Design a protein around this nucleic acid. Structure first.
Lengths: 134, 140, 181, 339, 55
RNA sequence: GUAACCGCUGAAAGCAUCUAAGCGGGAACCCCUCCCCUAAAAGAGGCGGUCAGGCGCCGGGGCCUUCCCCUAGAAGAG
RNA sequence: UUUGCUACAUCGAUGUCGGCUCUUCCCACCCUGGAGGUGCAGCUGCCUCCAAGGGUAGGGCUGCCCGCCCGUUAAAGGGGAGCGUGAGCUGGGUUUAGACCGUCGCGAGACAGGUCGGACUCUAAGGGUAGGGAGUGCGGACCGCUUGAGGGGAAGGAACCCC
RNA sequence: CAGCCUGGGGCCUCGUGAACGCCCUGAGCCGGUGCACAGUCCGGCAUCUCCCUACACCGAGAGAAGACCCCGUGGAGCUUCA
RNA sequence: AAGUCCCGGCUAAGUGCCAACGAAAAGGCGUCUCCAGCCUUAGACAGCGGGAAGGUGGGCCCAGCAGCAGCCAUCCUCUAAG
């Protein structure tokens, strides 16, 4: 959307059926990645995702009105280390996503925890509600 | 026996070369790029482009391999199909040499032609062997 | 049917020097000179009389007599070209974005069509003069083919507006021929 | 049911055989490229690798005018020795044979290092006087001029050898007569790297890659290993079928030699040419190589070959862009490579 | 038409009396041709211009 | 260099007409450029250098194993 | 490329479903490239012609094949090679011997109906292929440098974003 | 979506020392012919000789007078309303 | 092994170079040939300039279709002209 024009590609951190935490107050707590938007691959390979990628998730744990429903989300944190163009390696404590509306605005009104800058640059509406950006 | 291949039909000339070879003679074919082939340009090219597998060519003449695209190779490959398939047909094939232009050592010698292979025999629409090799890949 | 004998005459006017040698016919005149080879006219005898051109053939089928009458039209075009010039007009039609055209040596460059930043370029054949007056383009010359081919190259380069769009009349189009000069 | 998957490996690289020489020469050379007489290549030795911090030069780059981190390879390049002058022509048969070679070492350039490779000319056979007038007589039908050069390995102690390598490098520039004059001035002299290249240029690297011996099909072609049970089940590191037919059972993967192949690279940029080796040597030496003590090149990215591999550097034959000077370097990693 | 006829019954210089379309092969033909120059079909039709005003 | 096709000049067939003669354009296609193997190419290529000296003999030049090794390596090879 | 019809070949045996692995081909074109028509304003559609250089993926259900469905994608085309490939694997299906049920039979027993359990042999004369060494020829014994007939290649393909 | 490491083999050398395939040694391949899928026949295109390791695609590869199916005025065991 | 044999014609696609053996309906004035019928120096065909038409653009129905929207007739200022 806004920063893909740089080298937007990192270590392949997440897959299909990988679990993530939902880092916002939308109601969900845990989810499972169902689809990766944009990937097109080769024989036997599972589609991958890293920071600032749009994904489809299915909520496995949360409030009754969001449990077992499919949403769009972007990856904001990842455990596996990735390198910034100025040569620094970053690593987070868990894999997390934030759930967005179809037009890109966050569904929740608050984001818990730190956010990578590549996610804040590509998704301006998320950066508007994020408090700390790393 | 020196054969001048200027303005001569490729197939008609080759049948006289083969009989000369079969009688135990050495045949030099000079001006091998000036012989003609009847038909339009497109007609002749697909006659030779359906043999293509792959592309490149990389020396002085000498091989004679599955895809001739040199004016010397084209003339030699045409004669080879008219020769006997026994062991003599291989010994006799070594007595034929084709050149582009007249070499230095054959400059002042008498050449022959065959009057029933002349370009005057056909209504028109032919190409030269040099023009064919230009499109096949030989720089000539 | 086979026409047993057919013969035609082309009158050479004054101020014109016609030369014929080994099937090559060249015509010299005030406006210029034209050289054309007629080696492909098999079965046709071309005679250079003292004051006219003579073309003869016998037992012509539908294809030999079709050839003979095209050679006649070519010769009469050479004579006309060296006495009077050929002048084709092209019109410049634009809807919203004005079109700019300019001549640079042996090339015509067309820019700012329906808005695109590509520059369209057209070849100019030898012996031809191209000038831009305004909303019109004028192509000069003695050989009719070179004048016609050059004006058609300008015509063809600007067609590309005719891709992916319902035509709203944007391009450069041929207009007329044959001013006295 | 017969999904689609691309074939494993390139069909254009077969045979994957061992290279027949350690220093290959290019078969083709870049065009004149509108210059004045100069050589179109140089010879170097691969030392090691490190990383620098430069400010980006590419005006179209996303990181323009910013400090970015780049790996680099270090290539040690002493001067070479110009040995002979070689002229090519289209001979009878219409080929590209060699007309004559004009050697010049006797006036100055009496070397026995050169006799470790060639038991070269005696004083009796220094009749090179009439080789030169043959070149001048047969001028105007000469197509290419090439200079035979020799490396000087005895100037590199970490490279424990003294016999040299002999290659020929092409001259591209003005006229043929102009190129003959330039080639006679380099003859018997020592050619620095700065007479050929300059900082910021692009190059093409030709050499031999690191050898790896007889190998399987999972390393040679990256075929897929048999999944689950078959990981447990009668042999997994193999292909199932070897073709369908008796048509000369075809070009399918087989085990064999991996590495030590002649390859080529494109568009490798030179970032720095240095003489002060204290700015490039890491603490404790380059691991498994030694210390740099000659002129060196800093080439960004990777280079084929192992340490102490002779590399041929050539002008770019399909260049991507045309750089200008000064990719400014702000940091060089001089830390130890052990631990 | 983006490529008119030089001195003919050409149009876009203030007309729209366009060309003729073959129904078999699809090629363009002259306004006064009787059969296609590619296949010789005689199954020809006119290009569509526009509906001028109304009924 | 062409495919489908688009155009010019032009008759057969006074006109018209991209085609019949005669020309010009025109694709991830084909050939060259580029990369890899190439003088067992039978037309089996080219170029620089060594094979001291004395009277078959004396004397001598070269290459390999052995010796110390690794850039290479299943043995060979390099 | 289905299913039938025939009974020419194999009955002192050509291992009989599906899957995996790997290779290649056809074109009757799904996407990528070119051109045109339209009841083509633009965006998106629909249709016709050339073209096989490149691509055509991940999962849930069933032994499957077909098929239905989930989230994507430029598109997730369709076929052949003894229904390519068991001296490469597997062994879910199927067609032995054990056993249960339903229907049928006086019975022993049968089904083309369901269900549980049930073995996968071999050290490669020859060819082919992948690589690595010597010899003879060219051409008396050696050291070094080359050319570029010929041969192979997909060495690149595609999408998203900026203006 | 594979990578690295270890024991025993394999690889090179000394000693002991078999078996199956075998009309023939004459077996490169593509298109055909022909009981209808040829190493040997026809037409082409190829092909200098020997040795080592590795692979098992082809030799309708090796191994067993097909258990399936049908026939024979061949059997054997079981059954009963023969 | 024996004809680059002779005469009259056709084909431009490499069609074809096939006794038994491999192509239909349909389309082509592409070109070559034979039959019909109808116009031609009392000026044919095509083309070119003009007359290129008038009461009337008659009209029924209609604000109006002023051939050609729902049925249709049919009269001369005329002669080198409608």
């Amino acid at each position: 959307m806004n920063v893909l024009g740089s080298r937007k590609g990192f270590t392949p951190a997440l897959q299909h059926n990988s679990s993530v935490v939902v880092a916002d107050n939308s109601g969900a707590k845990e989810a499972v990645i169902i689809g990766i938007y944009g990937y097109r691959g080769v024989l036997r390979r599972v589609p991958f995702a890293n920071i600032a990628d749009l994904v489809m998730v299915s909520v496995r744990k949360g409030s009754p009105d969001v449990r077992k429903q499919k949403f769009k989300a972007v990856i904001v944190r990842q455990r596996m280390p990735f390198r910034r163009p100025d040569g620094t390696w970053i690593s987070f404590e868990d894999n997390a996503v934030v759930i967005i509306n179809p037009d890109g605005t966050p569904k929740g009104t608050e984001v818990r925890g730190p956010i990578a800058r590549e996610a804040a640059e590509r998704w301006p509406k998320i950066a508007s509600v994020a408090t700390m950006v790393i | 026996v020196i054969v001048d291949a200027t303005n001569q039909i490729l197939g008609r000339m080759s049948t006289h070369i083969a009989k000369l070879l079969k009688s135990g003679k050495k045949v030099y074919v000079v001006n091998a790029e000036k012989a003609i082939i009847s038909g339009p340009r497109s007609r002749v090219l697909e006659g030779y482009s359906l043999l293509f597998t792959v592309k490149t060519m990389q020396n002085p003449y000498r091989q004679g391999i599955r895809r001739p695209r040199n004016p010397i190779n084209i003339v030699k490959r045409t004669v080879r199909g008219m020769l006997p398939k026994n062991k003599l047909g291989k010994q006799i094939y070594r007595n034929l040499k084709a050149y582009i232009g007249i070499p230095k050592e054959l400059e002042g010698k008498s050449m022959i032609r065959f009057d029933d292979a002349d370009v005057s025999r056909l209504k028109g629409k032919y190409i030269t062997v040099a023009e064919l090799s230009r499109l096949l890949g030989g720089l000539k | 049917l086979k026409a047993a004998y057919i013969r035609e005459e082309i009158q050479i006017p004054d101020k014109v020097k016609v030369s014929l040698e080994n099937n090559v016919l060249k015509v010299k005149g005030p406006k210029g000179e034209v050289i054309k080879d007629f080696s492909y006219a098999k079965g046709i005898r071309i005679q250079l009389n003292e004051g006219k051109i003579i073309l003869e053939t016998t037992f012509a089928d539908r294809r030999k007599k079709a050839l003979l009458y095209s050679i006649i039209a070519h010769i009469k075009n050479m004579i006309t070209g060296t006495i009077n010039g050929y002048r084709y007009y092209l019109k410049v039609i634009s809807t919203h974005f004005p079109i700019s055209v300019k001549v640079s040596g042996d090339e015509v460059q067309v820019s700012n069509l329906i808005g695109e930043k590509n520059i369209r370029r057209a070849k100019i054949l030898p012996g031809v003069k191209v000038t831009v007056k305004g909303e019109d383009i004028v192509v000069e010359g003695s050989d009719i083919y070179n004048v016609a081919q050059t004006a058609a190259n300008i015509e063809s380069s600007t067609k590309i507006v005719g891709y992916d769009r319902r035509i709203f009349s944007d391009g450069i189009y041929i207009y007329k021929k044959e001013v006295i000069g | 049911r017969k999904l689609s998957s691309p074939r494993r490996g390139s069909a254009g690289l077969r045979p994957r055989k061992r290279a027949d020489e350690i220093l290959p020469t290019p078969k083709n050379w870049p065009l004149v490229n509108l210059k004045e007489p100069k050589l179109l290549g140089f010879i170097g030795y691969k030392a090691g690798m490190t990383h620098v911090y430069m400010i980006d030069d590419k005006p179209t780059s996303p990181n323009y005018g910013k400090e970015v981190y780049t790996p680099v390879t270090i290539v040690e390049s002493p001067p070479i020795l110009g040995l002979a002058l070689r002229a090519y022509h289209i001979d009878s048969k219409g080929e590209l044979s060699v007309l004559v070679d004009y050697w010049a070492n006797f006036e100055e350039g009496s070397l026995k290092y050169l006799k470790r490779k060639i038991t070269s000319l005696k004083v009796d056979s220094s009749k090179m006087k009439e080789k030169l007038d043959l070149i001048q007589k047969n001028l105007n039908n000469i197509t290419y001029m090439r200079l035979l050069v020799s490396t000087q390995p005895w100037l590199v102690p970490s490279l424990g050898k003294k016999r040299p390598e002999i290659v020929e490098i092409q001259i591209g520039g003005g006229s043929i007569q102009d190129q003959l004059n330039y080639g006679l001035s380099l003859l018997g002299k020592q050619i620095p790297v700065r007479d050929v290249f300059r900082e910021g240029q692009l190059t093409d690297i030709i050499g031999v890659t690191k050898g790896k011996g007889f190998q399987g099909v999972i390393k040679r072609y990256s075929v897929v290993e048999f999944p689950r049970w078959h990981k447990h089940r009668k042999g997994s590191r193999k292909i199932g079928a070897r073709g369908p037919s008796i048509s000369t059972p075809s070009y399918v993967p087989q085990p064999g030699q991996l590495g030590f192949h002649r390859r080529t690279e494109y568009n490798k940029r030179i970032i720095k040419i240095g003489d002060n080796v204290n700015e490039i040597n890491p603490a404790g030496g380059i691991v498994n190589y030694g210390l740099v003590k000659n002129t060196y090149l800093v080439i960004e990215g990777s280079v084929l070959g192992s340490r102490k591999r002779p590399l041929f550097l050539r002008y770019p034959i399909r260049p991507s862009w045309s750089p200008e000077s000064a990719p400014k370097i702000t940091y060089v990693n001089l830390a130890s490579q052990q631990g | 038409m983006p490529l008119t006829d030089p001195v003919k019954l050409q149009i876009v210089q203030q007309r729209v009396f366009l060309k003729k379309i073959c129904r078999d092969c699809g090629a363009l033909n002259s306004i006064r041709a009787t059969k296609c120059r590619r296949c010789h079909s005689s199954n020809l039709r006119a290009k569509k211009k526009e509906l001028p005003a109304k009924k």
